[PDB]
């Protein structure tokens, strides 16, 4: 078991993302390093829901803690543009895990 339940998916229609600068950029549809192009896909993992149990994450000490499952993001490099100019590889934020957030009381 986990404190939070996550689910994974192959994302094939990402057209926009926030990059490491905190700016919105366009994510291109495909890539080319070798002989032919490769469509640009991402492997994402997100929370199934915010409260897998009534009071939040599973296994939390209800009396002393508030809790909530949250989707966390990581950086991956992606071929990107800015209003179809300045095409290049940028570090962008994508859903990568589900983490339990805590606060006393």
């Amino acid at each position, epitope marked *: 078991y986990s404190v939070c339940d996550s689910e994974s998916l192959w994302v094939t229609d990402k057209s926009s993302a926030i*990059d*490491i*600068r*905190g700016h919105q950029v366009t994510v291109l549809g495909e890539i080319k390093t070798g002989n032919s192009p490769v469509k640009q896909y991402f492997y994402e993992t997100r929370c199934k829901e915010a409260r897998p149990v009534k009071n939040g994450c599973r296994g939390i000490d209800d009396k002393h803690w508030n809790s909530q499952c949250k989707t966390s993001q990581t950086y991956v490099r992606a071929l*990107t543009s800015e209003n179809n100019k*300045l*095409v*290049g*590889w*940028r*570090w962008i934020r994508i859903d990568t895990s589900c983490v339990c957030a805590l606060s006393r009381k």
Partner: antibody
Amino acid sequence: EVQLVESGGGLVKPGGSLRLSCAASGFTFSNAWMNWVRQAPGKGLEWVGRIKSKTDGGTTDYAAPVKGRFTISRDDSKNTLYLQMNSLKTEDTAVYYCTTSGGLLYGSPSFGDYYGYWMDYWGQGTTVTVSS
Amino acid sequence: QSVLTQPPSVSVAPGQTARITCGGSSVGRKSVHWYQQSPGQAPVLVVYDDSDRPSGIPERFSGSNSGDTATLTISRVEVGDEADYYCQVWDIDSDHVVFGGGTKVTVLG
């Protein structure tokens, strides 16, 4: 206007020592991070080291080829930056520039910070020649 | 200690556009600053944070960042722009400010 005036350059033999000064004016020197940057004759710019403001801890960091031989210090009551160069090497021959850092909104930059930390003022430099 | 790479030289005629690229190191993870060094003078900041211009720098000087590479573009070049241009980044992987090797911009006046 901001002024940075380096002094103390000169010619020494390998293994000698020199002490560079940089007299600053026209800005709150005590709030600025200060750097030394050098340029060997006919080559590019090379960061030598930095000293933080006292607010941000007043600590120093040095470039790899200079660590253990050079010491940066500052005297806020005289608005002066110092570079103590001991055990000099011929590779240390360069013009030495004094530099302020700008774009520090949050004190010491964090791991995730993308923007900030440029060199907004440079002095005109002092020449150090190390030759046998 | 990581290598910020620039072409060593660019020649341009007055009125034309000069372009200086910079890659490697922490480009894409930390912003790029650009310095102009005229012969016999100290460097001068001409672009900061990829694309911002300090006060007093002509609008002809603009920088851009394409993620893995950064470009300084000097439009309507003048003979006064003949200088060495250096890009600069904070290198995460070695805890150093690092500069590119420098690009000598020759203006054919």
